């Protein structure tokens, strides 16, 4: 894995 993209308003 890399650093990732963050939340996309589904959560949480």
Residue 4 CB, shortest distance to other proteins, in Å, is 5
Tally of CA atoms within 13 A in the half-sphere of 8 that contains its CB: 2
Q: Residue numbers of the site for other proteins (CB under 8 A)?
A: 1-11
Residue 11 CA to residue 2 CA, distance in Å, equals: 21
Residue 1 CB, shortest distance to other proteins, in Å, is 5
Residue 11 CB, shortest distance to other proteins, in Å, is 7
Angle made by CA atoms 2, 7, 9, in degrees to the nearest 5: 155
């Amino acid at each position: 894995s890399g650093r990732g993209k963050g939340g996309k308003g589904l959560g949480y």
